[PDB]
Design a protein around this ligand. Structure first.
Ligand SMILES: C[C@@H]1CC(=O)Nc2cc3cc(c2N1)CCCCCN1CCCc2ccc(cc21)OCCCNC3=O
Length: 115
């Protein structure tokens, strides 16, 4: 089973758009982490493989995933990074949890269709 880039975009982009549509919860995740602007100078001591919504969107837009699981792995990498770095009481951690709840609901039927 070979997945063409347009077929992956058609199936998976709606699940990424669902996360962008969470406002304000997607705001911390819409651009690559910049620790100087965000005031978190130790970030890359903790997080070695950063990921954000715009990077995932570019990969889908340009055909960089060969298989649906690679896209799923990048979304969970984004979430796991934020749960790793942020305190459980923090706004970013709580926003991360809301996006993960949305993602689980949207991705389940789509992965069933691609499986
Ligand atoms: C996902 C990415 C990296 C991560 O994992 N955690 C952190 C930790 C932090 C921030 C983010 C993230 N988001 C990004 C947050 C969105 C708002 C940015 N901005 C725009 C609106 C006003 C304001 C005030 C204080 C501030 C950022 C901002 O920052 C204060 C210092 C501590 N700053 C974090 O504690």
């Amino acid at each position: 089973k070979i997945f063409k880039p347009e077929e992956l975009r058609q199936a998976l982009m709606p699940t990424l758009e669902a996360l962008y549509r969470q406002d304000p919860e997607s705001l911390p995740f819409r651009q690559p982490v910049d620790p100087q602007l965000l005031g978190i100078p130790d970030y890359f001591d903790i997080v070695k493989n950063p990921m954000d919504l715009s990077t995932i969107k570019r990969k889908l837009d340009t055909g960089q995933y060969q298989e649906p699981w690679q896209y799923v792995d990048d979304v969970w990498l984004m979430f796991n990074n934020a749960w790793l770095y942020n305190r459980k009481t923090s706004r970013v951690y709580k926003f991360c949890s809301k996006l993960a709840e949305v993602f689980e609901q949207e991705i389940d039927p789509v992965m069933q269709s691609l499986g």
